[PDB]
Amino acid sequence: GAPATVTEQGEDITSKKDRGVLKIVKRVGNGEETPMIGDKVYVHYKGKLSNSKKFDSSHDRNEPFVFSLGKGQVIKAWDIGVATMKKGEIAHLLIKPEYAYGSAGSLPKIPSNATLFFEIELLDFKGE
Ligand SMILES: COc1ccc(CC[C@@H](OC(=O)[C@@H]2CCCCN2C(=O)[C@H](c2cc(OC)c(OC)c(OC)c2)C2CCCCC2)c2cccc(OCC(=O)O)c2)cc1OC
């Protein structure tokens, strides 16, 4: 399924090349620009724990999910991965614990050493 496709064909977008964040572009976006650190980003997404025990559709549609890029408002994998997206792009991200909640997790929602998967659509981004 989608996570296995990212394992096998995904691009490693980590600085260390440790496969901690793997990406596939599922729908190509518009133009060439991608957001800079400090830009406000607007996304729709859905995500899950790799063991399929929790799923998040809070912003699948409904209200956009909004955060300032590269400011630690989200897990490290998102500041890395959303930054690589074009407006209108849809991407899949597969994320190891070191780029999400680590050995600590975020109990009881996120267990220790959880792998996460997301489908993310970048709607827009704007300068601070
Ligand atoms: C810099 O480090 C961190 C920053 C922020 C957090 C909190 C969780 C942080 O969650 C995340 O960064 C990732 C990626 C963005 C979407 C949410 N997300 C999650 O893991 C999801 C998540 C996690 C949550 O809490 C852990 C949520 O809050 C209850 C949550 O609410 C919608 C969603 C997971 C849910 C289970 C299935 C797997 C996904 C968060 C949650 C909700 C909104 C956020 O920013 C926008 C806003 O405030 O409107 C940020 C943890 C951080 O470190 C572990």
Numbering used by the authors: 13 to 140
Question: What did the authors write?
Answer:
The iFit ligand class (including its analogs SAFit-FL and SAFit1) were the first molecules capable of selectively inhibiting FKBP51. The binding of these ligands stabilizes a conformational change in the FKBP51 FK1 domain. As the G64S variant showed the strongest improvements in the binding affinity of both FKBP51-selective ligands and its role in the formation of the transient binding pocket is not obvious, we decided to explore the molecular basis for the binding affinity enhancement in more detail. In the FKBP51-G64S:SAFit1 (out/in) complex the loop involving serine 64 is slightly shifted and S64 engages in a hydrogen bond with K60. For the binding of SAFit-FL (out/in) only a serine substitution on position 64 shows a strong improvement in binding affinity. Strikingly, in the SAFit1-bound state S64 forms a hydrogen bond with the side chain of lysine 60, which seems not to be possible for the other G64 variants.
A paradigmatic example for a drug target with a transient binding pocket is the FK506 binding protein 51 (FKBP51), encoded by the FKBP5 gene. In humans, FKBP51 is linked to several stress-related disorders (e.g., anxiety disorders or depression), obesity, type 2 diabetes, and chronic pain.
